[PDB]
UniProtKB/Swiss-Prot annotation:
Record note on modification: Ubiquitinated; which leads to proteasomal degradation. Autoubiquitinated; interaction with USP7 leads to deubiquitination and prevents degradation. Polyubiquitination may be stimulated by DNA damage.
Origin species: Homo sapiens
Tudor-like 2: annotated span: 73-140
Tissue: Expressed in thymus, bone marrow, testis, lung and heart. Overexpressed in breast cancer.
Task of the protein: Multidomain protein that acts as a key epigenetic regulator by bridging DNA methylation and chromatin modification. Specifically recognizes and binds hemimethylated DNA at replication forks via its YDG domain and recruits DNMT1 methyltransferase to ensure faithful propagation of the DNA methylation patterns through DNA replication.
Complex formation: Interacts with DNMT3A and DNMT3B. Interacts with DNMT1; the interaction is direct. Interacts with USP7; leading to its deubiquitination. Interacts with histone H3. Interacts with HDAC1, but not with HDAC2. Interacts with BLTP3A. Interacts with PML. Interacts with EHMT2. Binds hemimethylated CpG containing oligonucleotides. Interacts with ZNF263; recruited to the SIX3 promoter along with other proteins involved in chromatin modification and transcriptional corepression where it contributes to transcriptional repression. Interacts with UHRF2. Interacts with FANCD2.
Disease: Defects in UHRF1 may be a cause of cancers. Overexpressed in many different forms of human cancers, including bladder, breast, cervical, colorectal and prostate cancers, as well as pancreatic adenocarcinomas, rhabdomyosarcomas and gliomas. Plays an important role in the correlation of histone modification and gene silencing in cancer progression. Expression is associated with a poor prognosis in patients with various cancers, suggesting that it participates in cancer progression.
UniProt note: domains: The tudor-like regions specifically recognize and bind histone H3 unmethylated at 'Arg-2' (H3R2me0), while the PHD-type zinc finger specifically recognizes and binds histone H3 trimethylated at 'Lys-9' (H3K9me3). The tudor-like regions simultaneously recognizes H3K9me3 through a conserved aromatic cage in the first tudor-like subdomain and unmodified H3K4 (H3K4me0) within a groove between the tandem subdomains. The YDG domain (also named SRA domain) specifically recognizes and binds hemimethylated DNA at replication forks (DNA that is only methylated on the mother strand of replicating DNA). It contains a binding pocket that accommodates the 5-methylcytosine that is flipped out of the duplex DNA. 2 specialized loops reach through the resulting gap in the DNA from both the major and the minor grooves to read the other 3 bases of the CpG duplex. The major groove loop confers both specificity for the CpG dinucleotide and discrimination against methylation of deoxycytidine of the complementary strand.
Record-given protein name: E3 ubiquitin-protein ligase UHRF1
Swiss-Prot/TrEMBL induction comment: Up-regulated in proliferating cells, and down-regulated in quiescent cells. Down-regulated upon adriamycin-induced DNA damage, in a p53/TP53 and CDKN1A-dependent way. Induced by E2F1 transcription factor.
Crosslinked residue numbers (Glycyl lysine isopeptide (Lys-Gly) (interchain with G-Cter in SUMO2)): 136
Superkingdom per UniProt: Eukaryota
Subcellular location: Nucleus
Region (Tudor-like 1): 7-66
Amino acid sequence: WDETELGLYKVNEYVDARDTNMGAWFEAQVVRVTRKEDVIYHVKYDDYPENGVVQMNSRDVRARARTIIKWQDLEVGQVVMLNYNPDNPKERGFWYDAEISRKRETRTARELYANVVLGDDSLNDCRIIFVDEVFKIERP
């Protein structure tokens, strides 16, 4: 934790950070960068100061989502960040990475399913409720 360096994201940058246990992405800020590509980010969460500073593998931090993909532009096989609730699927939850799986549409209804990646595994064929709040994933 004492080998300070300079890589992909910088000290004080606002980023998104993946919780390892649940697999959800949270707004966060890089407090220091050390050397373990194979960099370690020391991160604090914006809305969770009581969680302290947490060590991140570089695969678990990226630029913050800024771009919403509109319904019309959603395609099966797209990998996106979207909001889902495992325990209560009809309610609002957290932001996970997911693969769009099914897209159905009538004159009055719209149905979106995705395979949602959640920490340790993958959950197939989840009905996504928040169909207008699907983010593009920021890649370098």
